[PDB]
């Protein structure tokens, strides 16, 4: 199927860090630091909503500038339910679309039908039911919603523990009880049973929302995530090439404390 | 698959009436009157609960007596969730098992896993979500729950109108909106989409609970059911061979008022 | 009847974009960009209420200036229930009146009896019942209420999905059940049954409230609208001839992503 | 320890049926039918409470009569918290004491400290937390509370599914999360961790309350119980030797439908 | 076991005062004044939250600077549930980690599994049940939560009285009733029974949160604590060597009023 092709594409990002960037310079620092992809963003939605504004797709022009500055894959955000924003992003020729709750919602009741597109989608989740719903709609990659813009890891930890915990429950559960379990999650039975056989989520699972330090990033990997997203706070500090590199190093050497000491040392705020 | 074989078996009952019987005599009147099957019952559960008692599987002995008295298929009731009652009924060699809410519940949270059996199951439903849940668990045939023991048709009408109404909604619905619809029904998406393509329920749908007169039975057929169940009230009146025949005639000639007048005439109490 | 004449007039707008304008200059940019009509407005009601003021009919003088600047149809707003504001708008000789919830309400319980006028009316709606009520009162054209002044498309999507969804339900429904359905919508049965036979609304249905980008406009067309209204935000940016043209292009080529990329590029 | 000795004794009951009896005749029918033990009871507590009465320990005399009529182990009920009733039962020389919620409660806040006795105890439970609390107090054997006296199996199924379900959850759980899990169950952490390693309850687990038919008994075994208790309803029907034998046969052949047909056939009324 | 080794290490601190420091200078004044250990802190979390910020592990660099300035043990804070912050603190080679509610929480449902580490941990508590839960997770040392940042001793007194009071109840209690008592505390029975036999907490118990004066510190010792923590308020006054020494003197001579007068005199 073309679904398993999209799932396969997203697997190449396993073990990587994805960085939000607002210009080609940032994009280049990110690539040099060893990011596996970048996320294009004309303004951080934190700061548009701070001013009480609507946050939408970025201008295709600035996305094109970033696509040219780098050789790593490029992602961009569409509003939830805004399938025409997604059509535009596909036609520009980027690599992944993020149907993102950080932008202003466009449809209160329906997500994009992601099976109608050739490129893969990322969606967010707080729990296993939500993740399986996004996958059935055609998401090829899942991240935690966390809590964007705060630098606080609490919500991201809750979401990872929740998803992984339910998978563990499901793996060992009496088969006869799975029907009721699917009902309570409001999730498709067939994907529930498949998650039981795999013993893990059928797609890559990244952490996102509030990852601020090397320790944060390594924690997410130790809890069982496949990779991490990081926001543009990286570029508000002193040597942003150093802070970027540090987070990549942390995800790569997530189970080596000695390495984590080295990259954390003298990082400033 | 063996599932579609079970579905196929249940289809040969289309257009028929199924009668509850408590002995071989009743079973023979039923067969002679033109019933497509009988439902074996040592006591009516109405009257065991009337006395405040527990209603269970019938004694296998009396089921065997009925199986021998007739050449039409024989059905029997198991308590919801009581998979060992069902194993016994299968081993006796009857034709259909009804996982029945009219008997005392055995498991408050789980139905029988009906895929683990070779013979087909009937389950009840009040709405489309419930029906699709029973089917995914492996029911090959659906009936309305109605309201057993009252002779009042109102609950049965509510349930038929509900199921058929949601199927009509589903048939014409924007495909992108079906994901949310499946969530709200708490039903497996894949069976929802299949119901949309067929434009009807993937299994036979019978009416049950409160059918008392030829007019009642014909109404159910005019509302789009595939057949009807009838309780043992027909054996509590005069010439029960006449009352039984009348209901069969009504279901067969459900759109001929002249016929319905003839069979309804002078039917007594 | 003169009702079907008004319905026919409103159908000429199918496929078009309608732009709010505050002067003759704006009106001309709109016409040049390919707007099918303009909506005359002395001030945006967003900003009169922002100051806590009452928003009423525009001065007839400035409406006359706009009517002379252009050859496309001109629309104007009357307060809900203010049938004398409407009489004045008719006598000026504009083409369409919008009985508008964006202006301050004049009658809390009654809309204008729109059958007593020669020119066609637009009304807003949030759902099918509301739309059918407005039509029976004599609206010749329907738009979503959406959410005016915010640039947020969410309310408009809710309204379109709601109306279209109920029409799809109605189309396939057991005829015997339509009586109860009409009661629950609080709508005239005869218009419900007519909507069932057509399989769509008996009048043109436009989207309005929060359309800000080419993508927004195209989305509304892909969801099944007949056209779109757009506010004066278009004229607050650079090269407003470019932004205006972009939205027209988007509605015209609404199912061509390649086109949508081109018009969306470098817009701000 | 003497605790693990008591646990060991109770293993010999695995695979068996335990029957309530009110006299030596009933006790003999039970033994002949193949019961692994009997539970002595001067009256069914169902029927003493039916009359609104207090239900206590049985007269030691009638317990002695039953102990002599049979060669299988004999159990008897003590009221919850009534440690002197238990002392008496121990001194009579029976085999097991059931600290039973079917009798009238004697202490609303405290169970018997079962470690102060030489003979093993049975306790009831509705969930895993309750079971582990009873074990730490020194129960050597656990049963479901179910719902005694109704012939309705639903409460017993709820309790078995609950206990077994939590054990399965626990077996696979991140070790770091077990601290919070113990807190929420209000159960001793050390017994929780032990239950995680074994992958089952550290003691024998029987079903009780509402088992009325061979099918009921077999269902309990298929759900993972080690055995079943059955009340004196068995003796209120025709040929009670037949109904008793049938339930034993069902527990013995619990995964053979053909056998279950044979024993269920023509059993008369319950 | 290595657990009893950690318990033994924490006992060397009995009778002492632990001071929060933000630099090597402060650390040296503390050591000279007779502090039994220091707690390294790049900023007081009071003032990061005052600004509405997240409070995390300190930069390992500044911790290393403090570790080099002094020969007494050095402690540092990790966020609750952040076991990787703790791994980093272990690898730097400090002596004690404080899993601290004064920093921003990282895991709402789980504390660190402290048995997976070689160095000893401090945890906070408000009551006996909470203390026993922290110990079973592997804390080697307990402090009151008190109320950080206020200089108000009331919460600390509540917590000490609570813990000590329950231990006194437990010591004399009918053994048969201890099962129910363990359930109500939601604490492991085996640690409850051990606390009953000792007649005190199986680990050292310090007071923390709101200790501001020599009298405060002495009160905590008279109520039965084994030692006290003190914040960086000490360093915001004149001659902070004098204020530091005063608190050490108070804890050392906690039942001598004459001494307490002398050290309290003219302190500000």
Author numbering:
A (entry chain D), B (entry chain A): 22 to 290
C (entry chain C), E (entry chain C): 22 to 289
D (entry chain B): 22 to 291
Paper text:
We show that with diminishing volumes, nucleation becomes improbable, but this can be countered by seeding. Pdx1 and trypsin I droplet preparations required the use of seeds within the mother liquor. Droplets were collected in microcentrifuge tubes and stored at room temperature for 2–3 days with a mineral oil overlay to prevent coalescence. Lysozyme and Pdx1 crystals were concentrated by settling and applied to sheet-on-sheet (SOS) chips. Serial synchrotron crystallography (SSX) data for lysozyme and Pdx1 crystals grown in batch and within microfluidic droplets were collected on the new ID29 beamline at the European Synchrotron Radiation Facility (ESRF, France) using a 2 × 4 µm (V × H) beam of 11.56 keV X-rays, with a 90 µs pulse and 231.25 Hz repetition rate, and a 20 µm step movement between images. A JUNGFRAU 4M detector with a sample-to-detector distance of 175 mm (1.8 Å in the corner) was used to collect diffraction patterns.
Using Arabidopsis thaliana Pdx1, an enzyme involved in vitamin B6 biosynthesis, and lysozyme, we demonstrate crystal scaling to suitable dimensions and numbers for time-resolved serial crystallography. Here, we report the use of droplet miniaturization for the controlled production of uniform crystals, providing an avenue for controlled substrate addition and synchronous reaction initiation. The approach was evaluated using two enzymatic systems, yielding 3 µm crystals of lysozyme and 2 µm crystals of Pdx1, an Arabidopsis enzyme involved in vitamin B6 biosynthesis. The method was demonstrated with lysozyme and Pdx1, with crystals grown in droplets producing equivalent (if not better) diffraction data quality to those produced under batch conditions.
